Design a protein around this ligand. Sequence first.
Ligand SMILES: N[C@@H](CCC(=O)O)C(=O)O
Ligand SMILES: N[C@@H](CCC(=O)O)C(=O)O
Ligand SMILES: N[C@@H](CCC(=O)O)C(=O)O
Ligand SMILES: N[C@@H](CCC(=O)O)C(=O)O
Lengths: 254, 248, 254, 248
Amino acid sequence: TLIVTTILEEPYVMYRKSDKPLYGNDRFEGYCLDLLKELSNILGFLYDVKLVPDGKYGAQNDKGEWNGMVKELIDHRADLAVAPLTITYVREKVIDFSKPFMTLGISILYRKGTPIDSADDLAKQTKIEYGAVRDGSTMTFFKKSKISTYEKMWAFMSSRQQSALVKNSDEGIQRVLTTDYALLMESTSIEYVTQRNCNLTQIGGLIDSKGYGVGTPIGSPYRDKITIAILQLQEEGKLHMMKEKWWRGNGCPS
Amino acid sequence: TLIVTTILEEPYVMYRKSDKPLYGNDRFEGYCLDLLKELSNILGFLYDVKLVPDGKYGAQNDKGEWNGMVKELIDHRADLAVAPLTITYVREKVIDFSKPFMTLGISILYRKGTPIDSADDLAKQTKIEYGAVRDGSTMTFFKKSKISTYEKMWAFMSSRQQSALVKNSDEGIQRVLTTDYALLMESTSIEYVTQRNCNLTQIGGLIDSKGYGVGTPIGSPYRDKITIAILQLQEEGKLHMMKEKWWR
Amino acid sequence: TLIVTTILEEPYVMYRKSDKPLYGNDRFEGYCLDLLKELSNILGFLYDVKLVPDGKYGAQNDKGEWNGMVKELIDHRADLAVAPLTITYVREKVIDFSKPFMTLGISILYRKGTPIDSADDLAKQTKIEYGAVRDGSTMTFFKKSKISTYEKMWAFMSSRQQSALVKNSDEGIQRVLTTDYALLMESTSIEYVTQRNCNLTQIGGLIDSKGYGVGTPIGSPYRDKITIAILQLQEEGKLHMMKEKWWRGNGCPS
Amino acid sequence: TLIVTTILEEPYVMYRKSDKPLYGNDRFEGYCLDLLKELSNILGFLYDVKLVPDGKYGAQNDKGEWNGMVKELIDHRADLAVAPLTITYVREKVIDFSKPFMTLGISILYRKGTPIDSADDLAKQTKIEYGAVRDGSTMTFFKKSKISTYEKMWAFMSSRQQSALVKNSDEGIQRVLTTDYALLMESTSIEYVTQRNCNLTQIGGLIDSKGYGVGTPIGSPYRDKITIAILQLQEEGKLHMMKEKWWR
Ligand SMILES: N[C@@H](CCC(=O)O)C(=O)O
Ligand SMILES: N[C@@H](CCC(=O)O)C(=O)O
Ligand SMILES: N[C@@H](CCC(=O)O)C(=O)O
Ligand SMILES: N[C@@H](CCC(=O)O)C(=O)O
């Protein structure tokens, strides 16, 4: 019954590995699939997980058109977007969100051992290239900012958009590992990467503070039910357990 | 024009100190008044600040009846609750909230140098009394919990006719200072209090994670308008500045 | 039989909480205490845990005299030092160390939300006080450094009868929470603190890279044996489990 | 004077490319050769570099005899071993090691674009082959491991004896490049290899944590001197510069 739009993004949504045959929903796994399971059992709904065709989170182009999971909701093509979808004021204008299931902030993924310590440092040089995932909320934060440092950074990433803006986080990560590039990435995803790719680290602190919410078309009769369910899972300690399960690891030596 | 219900709690809402007599909204100062001033400018509304008459945040009795700021919104005696009001699943069933303007978790406030290291420490002893603000979300978190350790804690704090609970955070801070008592208090508040009193400290880390949001009655058109304005204030760095200003 | 010198330092060595009578080794708990049981079982020795009387890790004063746990090993007053004792070149000239049981680097503990991004930022000002634990290896790092940013930091933390230095980590943490002060602290301790004290954070990356080792006096019959045991425990995954056990926690929202 | 045993391994020990022929020590370049030069100047000694004849790191045979670089030291055939030689307890019982000059952990080197994410993914199946460098610490780690996942992986990589265990890292790399195969390799090497070959990637995180040390024969008159030198080189930011240099 319910159509769920989502996007590949480790460890939130990933393709499951099995020698066995996977049917529909079982093709996927991750933090967001476990959350989506909880939600369907608590609220009593059936659902069909569909990956967003353009593989984008969602941004409004200059024409005024949206793409990504946000457009799927606006156009009523999906009933819910269950993904690390960031809650922002530009999106609240066109779709609804549940209270957040996880908090995060934009920060920087880069290599260890360099003199770079802040966005300010990146803004003050051009040797190191830097950017964010195209049509993501990080890119939009930079595009719409009136703060000097971030305007200068947007001017830089914008002029190089074809190299600076990446298709997705996986591409951004490979770019940091193999070229002199820093990715503007959400903190939770940075935490995940840096406990595996031990030559990478977070640079500086968090640039902002926000959260991931389940998206719904404006006025959906599931928004509040979902908000209530998430808030209750939080209070029962089940979201912490989910987080530990997907982020758990041996880490890296210092 | 808009009727705003609120509650006294430092540094969110405090009586402005002055020689001459202050009237109306001018009697109040704090992080939430700055936030409210920002929202009124952005949104273009006038407002009137009224302290909730029963002095409570809001909980439901076993009869199904609410009190505090929550009941003011439910009963349509206020348009907005602009206070350090926690977003909880029990309150979402009766009122609406904007997305959070601040994040926090339940933690423990106690005097320094003692024995206690965490809520588990507290749950297995009775020498140190412990409690929470009556009819606040912290109290309700323990009351509704199915986690054995929190169930044990709720049993201890609700017996003896709830003598372990306090009427408000100030009565809680004074009790922590005058006797062997630990207050289950929200982290943002503990961070303010422990900067102001070197006798006090936070024990353990956070028990949970949640947010404060502006409360409105269900279906209010201001719900989303305020969500957008708060989210923009966050993104422009304005909320961070307000926090710095009030947390010293 | 064996005398083990140690020092209180959360969560490595702490007094156990108990309304009952606690004697001998049972009076203590913590990561180092679990390490110590493993070692006593693997090597088969009996032991008595004894806090270092001066309560210091150990440094050599301008007069030339060692103090702390280091001095206890030199004077054959302790058979082992089991604690978060940093392996350093100055110490290695006077005592022996097992291979590292844990890695770490010096970094900065300060409050969240400021413009300070690195040691460089602190070295160029005076309004923000900064320092380290007196007579520990981080103090000796700044005292012995020939790197100019660090030489400038030593000059500061070292002035006015060393007012910027603290007696222990606890006092340093309080000073950070209650005054405009930044503590130079090892990364493993910062991790523990910042996961409980949500308004505090690590500033910049790691200044250096080192490890903690079990210390013994030069010529110790248990020297190589202890080293074999640590390496094996590491290989068997036991040290990772001990770390997860003592650092486990809920974390802070973003 | 001093005979230093080593083994070719990028980017620690490699042959310098030159138009004119190169002789003796000048035939080699790399992180480990730079470390050796620094040790030479700190301690004041002359040395000669001789790749270990068998080209192996070290592993004690199914009897009790040692091969490769470990062997060389045991038999006093080499004064030192300056190479990416892993500090392990098995080796600790027959040779001395300095304190580590570099940290790392076993991880997986595979091809990109697959649902394979960890060692658990490799272990629970058998279509994709996986192995390690015959007679290195990685092999020995799986061999001596009592951890269920790793014993099962050693079961597989041993019954697949020939095909699964490779001669050296180059052969392993090649096998990953031209076959459905995942090589178990130390993280520092995978970091190097992957920067220089975009079709290769690290799979999952680190299996363990350990270090590389300069090896010497039991009770060598240079043990303590080398340890102190390496510790001082780190503290003066020099081992860090050598790392940035060879890994770009
Ligand atoms: N969570 C982001 C995607 C990642 C990013 O923008 O950095 C979004 O919802 O657009
Ligand atoms: N913020 C709480 C009040 C304080 C507390 O309960 O700790 C509430 O909304 O009820
Ligand atoms: N671990 C240090 C003490 C703490 C510090 O110096 O930061 C030592 O062995 O001296
Ligand atoms: N560094 C390893 C060789 C490479 C490996 O075993 O993965 C050793 O000393 O044995």
